[PDB]
Amino acid sequence: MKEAFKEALARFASGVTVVAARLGEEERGMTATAFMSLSLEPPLVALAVSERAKLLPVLEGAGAFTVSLLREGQEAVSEHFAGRPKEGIALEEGRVKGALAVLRCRLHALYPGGDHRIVVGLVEEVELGEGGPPLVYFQRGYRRLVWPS
Amino acid sequence: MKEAFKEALARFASGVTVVAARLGEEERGMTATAFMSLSLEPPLVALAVSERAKLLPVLEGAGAFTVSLLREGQEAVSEHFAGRPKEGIALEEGRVKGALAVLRCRLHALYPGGDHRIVVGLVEEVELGEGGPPLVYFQRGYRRLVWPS
Numbered sequence A, B: 001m002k003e004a005f006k007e008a009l010a011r012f013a014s015g016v017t018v019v020a021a022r023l024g025e026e027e028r029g030m031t032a033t034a035f036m037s038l039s040l041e042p043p044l045v046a047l048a049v050s051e052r053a054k055l056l057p058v059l060e061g062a063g064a065f066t067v068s069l070l071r072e073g074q075e076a077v078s079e080h081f082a083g084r085p086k087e088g089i090a091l092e093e094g095r096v097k098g099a100l101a102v103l104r105c106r107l108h109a110l111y112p113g114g115d116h117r118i119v120v121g122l123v124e125e126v127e128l129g130e131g132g133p134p135l136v137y138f139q140r141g142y143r144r145l146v147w148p149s
């Protein structure tokens, strides 16, 4: 079921992020396309994390997390943090190295979201990688932007 | 202000949507990139609408709204509903005709989101348009996806 809903959302293109959190001995990363800018004042971003995600309890307990925006060529990173292991993929300094950008957030608020939890982060630090095209997901596949334009 | 934050978010590619609501014959439309799939069961989507958006009052009052996913070549529609009026642009049946897809939602919840409000919609109807490339926004500009024949 939900074929129509999925076909519709498959038609919404987006960049790809890796959301990560560290709580004690555990540090987890998870691939997420459900990400969006939320506020400028204060600087907030919103994400939807599955209630079934192992990342969730870690992020909740940590009270802070990072969001790395993947660039073109990082499909392997996305696949790895999406549950399809790739050799040698790892987080460095709590985030994805070589990403277009990294947002280090303090957990600002959480809200119910059906089978997902709405996670709101207050951006406290911003890391900017070198400019370039992003990793894009649209219609059930990784895509590239016609770049430059 | 918030130069780094803006630069980072400009690095998150996304499709472009037009959110609309109506109270009788008073109908408002607003361009938005802050949109994401939220839940499958129930089928929910989330978006961020500025607290100063004229659309918000109507959306709350209506308790329902639509989200149209724009396709490649609809930059004019995006600009129009972004506050820069264009010729011959109008909502039809409460949404944008000729879009990749339209989601007709019932307002499910409203949560605090800084200078924006988190709008959660319960998808009650889905409309799909012809297939094809989407309208993408990235690095302060409309972009096209590599999608050759």
Ligand SMILES: Cc1cc2nc3c(=O)[nH]c(=O)nc-3n(C[C@H](O)[C@H](O)[C@H](O)COP(=O)(O)OP(=O)(O)OC[C@H]3O[C@@H](n4cnc5c(N)ncnc54)[C@H](O)[C@@H]3O)c2cc1C
Binding pocket: A016, A027, A028, A029, A030, A031, A032, A033, A034, A035, A048, A049, A050, A052, A053, A054, A055, A056, A078, A079, A080, A081, A082, A083, A084, A085, A089, A090, A091, A116, A137
């Ligand atoms: C394009 C795409 C977009 C997606 N968007 C979303 C979304 O917006 N929201 C959502 O809830 N789900 C999304 N998913 C699915 C989601 O990624 C999987 O359901 C989820 O990753 C499983 O995550 P988990 O935290 O439960 O961890 P696990 O099931 O354990 O999966 C995490 C994977 O990441 C690896 N990993 C975890 N931590 C580390 C670490 N510290 N170092 C190295 N490797 C590590 C693991 O080896 C494992 O394979 C998306 C999937 C794809 C393919």
Ligand SMILES: Cc1cc2nc3c(=O)[nH]c(=O)nc-3n(C[C@H](O)[C@H](O)[C@H](O)COP(=O)(O)OP(=O)(O)OC[C@H]3O[C@@H](n4cnc5c(N)ncnc54)[C@H](O)[C@@H]3O)c2cc1C
Binding pocket: B016, B027, B028, B029, B030, B031, B032, B033, B034, B035, B048, B049, B050, B052, B053, B054, B055, B056, B078, B080, B081, B082, B083, B084, B085, B089, B090, B091, B116, B137
């Ligand atoms: C690429 C892009 C992405 C954006 N994403 C977001 C976002 O995610 N969230 C956000 O809050 N803001 C976003 N904005 C800015 C936002 O679009 C403007 O702040 C907002 O449109 C002003 O909305 P308003 O509802 O107050 O209406 P207005 O300032 O009145 O703007 C709405 C425009 O739509 C037209 N319009 C309204 N109703 C109708 C109708 N029934 N028929 C025909 N035309 C109509 C108007 O003529 C007007 O020009 C984005 C802007 C751009 C350029």
Ligand SMILES: NC(=O)c1ccc[n+]([C@@H]2O[C@H](COP(=O)([O-])OP(=O)(O)OC[C@H]3O[C@@H](n4cnc5c(N)ncnc54)[C@H](O)[C@@H]3O)[C@@H](O)[C@H]2O)c1
Binding pocket: A005, A006, A007, A009, A010, A033, A034, A048, A050, A139, A140, A141, B037, B038, B039, B040
């Ligand atoms: N937001 C998410 O939770 C999310 C986003 C994309 C991918 N995924 C996972 O990857 C699989 C493949 O995705 P695809 O886009 O290639 O094909 P798909 O047809 O399974 O999904 C199409 C779109 O529908 C939405 N969606 C699908 N499953 C969802 C879920 N469980 N919760 C919320 N939204 C969902 C997402 O926007 C997804 O991109 C999905 O079935 C899901 O397991 C999860």
Ligand SMILES: NC(=O)c1ccc[n+]([C@@H]2O[C@H](COP(=O)([O-])OP(=O)(O)OC[C@H]3O[C@@H](n4cnc5c(N)ncnc54)[C@H](O)[C@@H]3O)[C@@H](O)[C@H]2O)c1
Binding pocket: A037, A038, A039, A040, B005, B006, B007, B009, B010, B033, B034, B048, B050, B116, B139, B140, B141
């Ligand atoms: N989510 C939003 O509210 C949103 C999204 C994009 C565009 N816009 C409007 O269009 C203008 C141009 O944007 P641009 O991307 O071409 O260059 P920009 O540098 O002005 O914006 C960069 C990115 O930061 C985020 N952002 C910017 N202003 C925001 C705001 N007021 N609230 C929440 N997030 C914000 C968005 O993701 C935007 O794409 C922005 O200044 C803004 O007025 C608003």
